[PDB]
């Protein structure tokens, strides 16, 4: 039932939501560290030992 | 008993009724979807499942 003029608006919403989950993960930071932009290991020194 | 001048008028009525059932099915629509013009399946997503 949904027309193609409906699917244009639903696609406009879907691309805006996906641009938003690209933005909020692309530029978010704790102390200048992009948490979700790239994959890496953060190592925590939790002890006096090496 | 009916004369042929009668059958001309009855045929005029019958062709007008058939033009009307051609029109009201040719151009009727819910959200830009011609329901009776062509034969096809409308699938309803009635569940979260695919």
């Amino acid at each position: 039932t949904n027309s193609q003029s409906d699917l244009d608006s639903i696609q406009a919403e879907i691309t805006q939501r996906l641009n938003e989950i690209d933005r909020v993960s692309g530029q978010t930071q704790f102390n200048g560290v992009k948490v979700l932009a790239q994959d890496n290991t953060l190592t925590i020194q939790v002890g006096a030992n090496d």
Side-chain angles (χ1 to χ4, degrees), chain A:
Chain A
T1 299
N2 283 322
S3 53
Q4 292 163 351
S5 295
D6 201 310
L7 293 182
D8 287 12
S9 88
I10 278 180
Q11 193 55 52
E13 186 67 287
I14 281 182
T15 63
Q16 195 78 270
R17 293 288 197 175
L18 293 179
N19 286 166
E20 200 243 12
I21 80 172
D22 198 14
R23 168 204 77 85
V24 78
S25 92
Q27 43 210 28
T28 186
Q29 42 182 61
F30 178 82
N31 206 3
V33 181
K34 311 288 189 185
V35 281
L36 289 188
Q38 216 75 32
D39 183 350
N40 65 328
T41 59
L42 299 86
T43 59
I44 302 285
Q45 192 57 208
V46 166
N49 267 350
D50 282 5

